Amino acid sequence: TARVKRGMAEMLKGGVIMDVVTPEQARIAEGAGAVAVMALERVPADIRAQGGVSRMSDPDMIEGIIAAVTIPVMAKVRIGHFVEAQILQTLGVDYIDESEVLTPADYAHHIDKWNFTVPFVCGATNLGEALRRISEGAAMIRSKGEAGTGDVSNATTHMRAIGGEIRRLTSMSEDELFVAAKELQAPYELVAEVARAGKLPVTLFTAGGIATPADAAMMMQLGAEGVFVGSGIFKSGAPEHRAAAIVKATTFFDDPDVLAKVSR
Amino acid sequence: TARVKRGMAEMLKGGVIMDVVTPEQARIAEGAGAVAVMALERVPADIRAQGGVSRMSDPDMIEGIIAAVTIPVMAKVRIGHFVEAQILQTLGVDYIDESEVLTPADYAHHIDKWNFTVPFVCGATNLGEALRRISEGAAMIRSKGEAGTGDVSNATTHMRAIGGEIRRLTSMSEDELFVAAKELQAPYELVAEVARAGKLPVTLFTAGGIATPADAAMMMQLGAEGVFVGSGIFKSGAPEHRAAAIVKATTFFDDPDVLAKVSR
Amino acid sequence: TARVKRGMAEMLKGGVIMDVVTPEQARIAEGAGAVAVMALERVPADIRAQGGVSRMSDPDMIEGIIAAVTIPVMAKVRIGHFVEAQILQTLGVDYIDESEVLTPADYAHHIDKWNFTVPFVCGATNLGEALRRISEGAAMIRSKGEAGTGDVSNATTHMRAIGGEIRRLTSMSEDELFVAAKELQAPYELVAEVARAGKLPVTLFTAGGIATPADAAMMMQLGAEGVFVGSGIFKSGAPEHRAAAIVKATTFFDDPDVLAKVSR
Amino acid sequence: TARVKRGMAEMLKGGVIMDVVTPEQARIAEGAGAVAVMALERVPADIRAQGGVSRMSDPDMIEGIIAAVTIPVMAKVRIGHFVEAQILQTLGVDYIDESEVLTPADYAHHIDKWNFTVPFVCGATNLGEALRRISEGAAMIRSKGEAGTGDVSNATTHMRAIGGEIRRLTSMSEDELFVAAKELQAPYELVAEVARAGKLPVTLFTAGGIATPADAAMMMQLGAEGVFVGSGIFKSGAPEHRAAAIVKATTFFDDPDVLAKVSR
Amino acid sequence: TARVKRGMAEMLKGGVIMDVVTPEQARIAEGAGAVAVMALERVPADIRAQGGVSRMSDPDMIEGIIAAVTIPVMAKVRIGHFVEAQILQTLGVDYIDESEVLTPADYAHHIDKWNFTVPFVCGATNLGEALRRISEGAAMIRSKGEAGTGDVSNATTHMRAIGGEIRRLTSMSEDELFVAAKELQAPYELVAEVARAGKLPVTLFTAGGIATPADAAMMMQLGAEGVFVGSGIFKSGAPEHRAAAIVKATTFFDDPDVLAKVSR
Amino acid sequence: TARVKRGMAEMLKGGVIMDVVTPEQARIAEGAGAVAVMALERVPADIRAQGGVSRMSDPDMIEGIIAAVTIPVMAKVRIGHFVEAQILQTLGVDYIDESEVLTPADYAHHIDKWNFTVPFVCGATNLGEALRRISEGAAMIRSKGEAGTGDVSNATTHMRAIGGEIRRLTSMSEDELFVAAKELQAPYELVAEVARAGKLPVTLFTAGGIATPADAAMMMQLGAEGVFVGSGIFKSGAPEHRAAAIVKATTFFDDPDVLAKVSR
Fold first, then answer.
1. Is E170's CB within 8 Å of D173's CB?
2. Is C167 on the interface with A (CB under 8 A)?
3. Cβ C187–B185 below 8 Å, yes or no?
4. Which residues are involved in binding D-glyceraldehyde 3-phosphate (chains A, B, C, D, E, F)?
5. Residue F74: what are its φ and ψ, rounded to 5°?
6. How far is B93 from chain A (nearest CA, A)?
7. Domain spans in chain F, listed from the N-terminal domain onward
8. Superfamily name and number for B1-264
């Protein structure tokens, strides 16, 4: 077996991770039944319009979130910014998200995630990319979707791309898997393990553009093991109600009466 | 004999389906002699005008329309958004429109409409596209026209393209129908059936850009079995009159005296 | 339940079909354990070297072969030459091969094989092509390989293309099969049946460029259900022995000690 | 033994050089533990936003900075402006930065830095460029990064380019170093010395787009021997504290608990 | 550690492998001090001019070579021809060469060499290709050079390419090895092992275009662990003398007096 | 002061070097007043005419020439063939010509000529190329001209290009010499030295296409310090006369009366 950071997100499966910019938002998230919160200073929707350089959040801000909840807290670093990660790891965040939402710090190389104890979430749009993040030590993959737009279509494409390629490897003649690893630009040892197992070596969540309960449930029905949702869930008026509806739609994704009720 | 959801819109034939954003618009529609209404929260003229993501309407908004009228009520979902459709089916709408007017949720795949009891309406611009929608389970086909523009010319092109290709199949040498299905990118079984019957396997209506009584009757004379019209009708000032004019034009499409009178 | 000429080559499965140009060859083929013979006047390697138009063989020549053997006799027609096929059918050939080795008679359209009682074999290089031949009534598919060169590599390609795409359909998400049929340019009903069954709807044999016992056994191990071989078998040395060696290799395709002995 | 101005920045190694626009900034820089200050009239972020030609600063302004601090003072000249450099040298600056932040005065040729006593710093984005600056007499190389944007990613690129090519030369087969010098467009004698020593011939610092303590420490961990930082340090809040935090981060670049505390 | 067929060619290191087409050539090879012979029916020089399809040799011919010597005997299969390999393995050859000299049988896929007990030699022109052959189970790599031309220049390029990339990985920053594996289109686990070890995971020989003692010794001085030479060594008049000279030049490759003596 | 193998051909200056394929040609050459001979087994006119690979000559053939004359003997190796050079050095040739007339053994790298005691001659067509050869250890530079054609015009272009660029450096502003070395792709130290001395760092001779006495004296008047001529001289009929004419033309290159007489 290939070297993979396995089983590091079991408690998050079936759950929603919510972006939160205040300890008040964090408590609303936890009371709604979120499995984790993502601490950030500035939103993907405001990053998308305002546009400075976006970096790791202030450690005081992230501590203020940690102090407010008992569920796990994640926070973001810029791609390739292994010192921002060294800092986050000493704060005691439960996960680091090496995130394309922030301004990349390295255009070529991601963080060598084997240099850390803390588990990392990384983004992917296709199975090759997911496997390259996992080869570098990622303990969870999420789709990139399109961050801060509310448009679920890119997340649909990512989840169908990753899941469609896993399915194609499972039924593939074994002698063609070497060329498949070359075409995926992924390590053969992980390609062969996905062909045998029919699963990504780590848990796969959806992120990017999930706006409604119907969206979240659709991403679950496409193979997602859990979902990330943005702070718009707070910015829109009955925040307890909206957060709770997405949690229930993720848990009971296959029940259309539930989805109708929580969508009202 | 190929698999098609046949005969699911017999009561709509010869009629007008009107978009409605309020129970009052719904009552005016039904008073004017509409055969069904299409519930939606914001219109194709405001979608084209504002943008942002357009999704399935709030289920309470739709239920308000169902409570206001006796005639069938339709509502829209995003292309490929099978969970928006799961939700609508439990609401008890009579038809679901898998609609290119909303923001697509899946840029590659449409909903597998065989997984539903409720019938779907899908758009097409040519016969190959109509047949692929039917192959997926569509129960009615409409033209896409150009939504919310009041320009009927796209709808004319769609109706002539679909009708023109049906005609071409009817007189085609039978041995050439295999290559015709390949050039149409459509299932041979449905191509062969169109070639024998001279008809689309399900009802064909016109939508997109129907502004006047003359537009509506022209689409009927080009082979439409009914028409969809936008809420433009209610934006116009004496809405009971505009709505009733379009209904009479569609019933009496072959009578130039009636068409002159209702355009006055 | 799709329309297909099923189960018309049960007696040939596992066997070798040999091209024969004289009644004496046909006798050697049959005493060597061939399952059928392909009667032809001029060989694919002769057509490939010399110019000229290549057509259906003289009916007297084909009748000379029918009278010489008890096993089934096949013979070729040009693609799209439905009258060549009407003539062969009345001769009482067991199969007609609509063959790209001859000069095509119709560059656009194949024979509508539903107009015949006699079964057809057609060539394919990929699954979409195979399914379009079956949709026209073919009762058996063979690879095109590269005929009369003795280079098995094109056959390897075709066999891997066809079997690789069948495998990909079997694990594909059901809702993606409609787009898959559009990309394969094949009828959905045949595509969905391949996805459910894991097999082509009719028997699949290899042809083209099979020169040695190792080639024949390699094609069986790639999923071929039988092989066609050229009259080169006759053209060299002790023909009884070379033909028996290919029949044995195809029968015992998984036994390397048998394959080593017959390769001497 | 190649001709190089070696060992002219021994006292700056490990330290931070801060841009200063007034004697008060220069005092805060020095009390914060900066190793040197870069005297300039108008900042890289001001040059980047407003138009105009940017030249050597007024000698009175530079003299005001020299009189205010005990640590070394550097100041800038336009590329190729050897007379700007003659003037600065007589002012008694400790270093002259031949800087791509100013408007170049010669688009083809850099200053022949051998004509001067005072040492020069020059920018580089890759090892070949660094070696060509050293060949012209530069006593120190810094990355160009992307000046006045706060985005560290260009600096990451330059630091990885330079250090990656030094590493590649150290393990290269000796007989290939002649072609390597031709591909780098650098003098062979300097290339061969880099291959033998594993180090650039002069001190290498990072500059451009370093905004936070994490950035500064990341550049040291990529091999920088010191960092330049912009006057943004002053521009925000408690300047004594922000400047001390960068000096501490650069000093203790490998200590994540120190880096976490100074990031608050 | 990655899965590699290690240590399977220890007795060949420092040695020459000679192509032989007769048991007489085989005995001359062995008496000259060859470590192994390569049994073939037809020469790369005659394949290059004559040009039929080139396949596995007759098993009788290969047995006749095995019977003639005590040193190991190798023989060739076409690329991707895993049945020709199944046959060779039962003959008891000591190595199979999956060879580009023969007509490939599969344009896309090589043999899955893990399906065999017998070790395989495969060709490579660069480190990525070598690692992909080893990932598939190869137990030895040789350069491709340019077969049957007597021109050593392509072998020079291959050996400098493979050896130059191994050197570049050894000094590379560890965090850049993930991207290096992507650029090499090679499994990360083998790229990381070459970076750590500074050696290919299996032995590396030169082949292709070695004509003289000076050529052989040059390929050894470029990192080759042994050499393959073609049957031209026999076709040129004092075959005992020529074969012996190449053996000595390979063994004593670093002694120019030896190389002068054996070149006379 | 840059590293160059200086002063190694002082005894050849003012002279002619003649290609010889036999001890008899060597004696005629030396009788005619040649300053050295170039031993080779087959000529540039027969290489151009036949092709196949051209290598270092048989060491016995070379030793035969060394035994036949008192004057220095050169011999050729393939570009990059450092082991052919190792062999020649032990033979005791006075110079090795790393020659583009033979088939290159390395298409990227030339021999590292510093690893030898024996001096090398290398070809150039421009000053940048001459300097790179010298950087590698060449002790003499010749033009490539166009070998074995009898057309002097390539040699004229080479001599004018090398001499013209030396002249251009001599009067160039010193600050522009850095960019000149970059545009020449040559080491700054050797460029600077040429700019100060107005001379190539080692002797420059002309070769390639010198057919008549007038050609030889023209190349001397273009700055050649000596000439190489092909064995064409001996192919001509009264070889003692043709050889002596070219020698006298090269000694007396500035005397039109002598040039007229020896051309008669």
1. no
2. yes
3. no
4. 160
5. -105, 160
6. 13
7. 1-264
8. Aldolase class I (3.20.20.70)
